[PDB]
Ligand binder design. Sequence first.
Ligand SMILES: Cc1cc2nc3c(=O)[nH]c(=O)nc-3n(C[C@H](O)[C@H](O)[C@H](O)COP(=O)(O)O)c2cc1C
Length: 138
Amino acid sequence: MKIVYWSGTGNTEKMAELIAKGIIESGKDVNTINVSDVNIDELLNEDILILGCSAMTDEVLEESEFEPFIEEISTKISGKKVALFGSYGWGDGKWMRDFEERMNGYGCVVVETPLIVQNEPDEAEQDCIEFGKKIANI
Ligand SMILES: Cc1cc2nc3c(=O)[nH]c(=O)nc-3n(C[C@H](O)[C@H](O)[C@H](O)COP(=O)(O)O)c2cc1C
């Protein structure tokens, strides 16, 4: 499988690693890819797109890299399964609620409740691993 994410300080990156750990513990392989190194054509071949990005500016997706990436794949993902995640700091998940609505509007099937964790996982480390296990169980 594949996990594509953007992280500014490493919080979402840590979530990605843990989600990957859950998928692997379930017996499957998974590649963690920073959005800057992603290959769209290779990504679109996947049965499930696992996408992550922290809350930026005022409850939006990161603007310089992640946002453009979502825009580029937006017209080629209708009917595709996607799982969303990300770390946030002071809000309560607005950027993620919007991200979910957005992907749905592109015709994607959001397979699980998006995983959001405040700051670095820490106590939520197991929640990240379990999210990965749910995705692997699809
Ligand atoms: C410029 C900037 C704007 C932010 N905007 C939001 C926001 O609107 N809502 C929120 O809850 N957190 C916001 N945050 C906090 C980050 O989402 C949070 O620190 C998260 O843990 C960072 O994850 P990362 O290391 O993966 O980027 C913002 C952080 C920065 C640097």
